Amino acid sequence: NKLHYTTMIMTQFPDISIQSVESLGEGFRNYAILVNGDWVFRFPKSQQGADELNKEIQLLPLLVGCVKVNIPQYVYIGKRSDGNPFVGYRKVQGQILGEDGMAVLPDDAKDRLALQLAEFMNELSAFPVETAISAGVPVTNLKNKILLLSEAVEDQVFPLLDESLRDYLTLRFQSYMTHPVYTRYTPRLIHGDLSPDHFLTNLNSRQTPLTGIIDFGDAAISDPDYDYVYLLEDCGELFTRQVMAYRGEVDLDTHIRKVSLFVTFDQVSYLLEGLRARDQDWISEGLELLEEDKANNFGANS
Ligand SMILES: Nc1nc2c(ncn2[C@@H]2O[C@H](COP(=O)(O)OP(=O)(O)O)[C@@H](O)[C@H]2O)c(=O)[nH]1
Ligand SMILES: [Mg+2]
Ligand SMILES: [Mg+2]
Ligand SMILES: [Mg+2]
Ligand SMILES: [Mg+2]
Numbered sequence: 273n274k275l276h277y278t279t280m281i282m283t284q285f286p287d288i289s290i291q292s293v294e295s296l297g298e299g300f301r302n303y304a305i306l307v308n309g310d311w312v313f314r315f316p317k318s319q320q321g322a323d324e325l326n327k328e329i330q331l332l333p334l335l336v337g338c339v340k341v342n343i344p345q346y347v348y349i350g351k352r353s354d355g356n357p358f359v360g361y362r363k364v365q366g367q368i369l370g371e372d373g374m375a376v377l378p379d380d381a382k383d384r385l386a387l388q389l390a391e392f393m394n395e396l397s398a399f400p401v402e403t404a405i406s407a408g409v410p411v412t413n414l415k416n417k418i419l420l421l422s423e424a425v426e427d428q429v430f431p432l433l434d435e436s437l438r439d440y441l442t443l444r445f446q447s448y449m450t451h452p453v454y455t456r457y458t459p460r461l462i463h464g465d466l467s468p469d470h471f472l473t474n475l476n477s478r479q480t481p482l483t484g485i486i487d488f489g490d491a492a493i494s495d496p497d498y499d500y501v502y503l504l505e506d507c508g509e510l511f512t513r514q515v516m517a518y519r520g521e522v523d524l525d526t527h528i529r530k531v532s533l534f535v536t537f538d539q540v541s542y543l544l545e546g547l548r549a550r551d552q553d554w555i556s557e558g559l560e561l562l563e564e565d566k567a568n569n570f571g572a573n574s
Contacts, residue, residue: 385473454529
């Protein structure tokens with residue numbers, strides 16, 4: 273409730289003179305409003321959102337000096353009656369790119385974006401892991417996570433699928449588990465939600481089309497390749513290869529094959545969560561995404 277949000281801001285930060293309040297955006301974890309056209313106030317929607325925010329509160333101050341683009345800097349830190357936090361930060365300027373917006377960038381700008389994104393990812397990968405861990409960033413046991421997923425999928429998802437889709441999923445999980453090249457990695461800090469719905473851009477700039485990056489709630493210590501997952505899903509294979517090349521990846525084919533598997537796993541994880549929530553529209557969406565994934569990977573099987 274936007275009126276209730278305004279009330280908490282006024283009570284806890286009475287010196288903010290509120291002239292305007294509007295809805296700005298919403299995800300699965302947070303509701304965001306814009307105050308005075310300048311300040312984003314972001315309120316967790318769930319205990320999980322609050323736990324992710326507590327991590328961001330500790331991590332983001334450590335990142336600012338290490339990352340070139342702008343990121344949220346929490347200047348106001350509030351508390352709700354249940355004890356969980358909410359935050360206010362100066363709006364990260366620019367227009368949200370979005371999946372739909374990525375397609376139409378002039379190639380010069382696309383290339384500039386690929387370079388900036390490559391540089392951002394390199395700085396995350398360079399951040400000391402123990403420093404992140406001491407700031408409460410969780411360590412993802414990626415191999416065990418995928419093992420557990422494969423089991424939950426066979427049990428809970430397979431009964432909804434036709435035989436061709438079940439065989440496809442069996443093949444994909446087996447591919448990741450069978451080839452040691454895919455499962456050996458040095459753990460690194462990743463953003464964890466690196467998609468164009470979090471890319472703030474200024475299409476009227478040449479050297480720096482990427483203005484900033486938001487939503488660090490999924491930051492984790494994991495396989496750094498996992499940070500390509502939304503680039504491949506939303507921005508496409510060519511773009512992803514361009515970012516990889518700028519980061520100095522010598523084996524593009526192998527790493528694209530690997531990220532593609534992560535994309536499959538993310539899609540089935542999404543469906544599984546929808547299923548557990550008995551959310552019918554979410555399940556329908558998840559099934560469509562799965563069908564699309566299989567079609568996108570025709571021939572990858574052989
Ligand atoms: N333009 C702009 N939009 C923002 C900013 N912060 C949040 N938003 C919008 O609010 C939405 C929800 O914020 P987010 O941190 O992604 O929430 P979550 O996905 O639920 O964790 C985002 O997807 C953006 O659409 C900002 O600094 N600038
Ligand atoms: Mg988000
Ligand atoms: Mg989480
Ligand atoms: Mg988030
Ligand atoms: Mg590698």
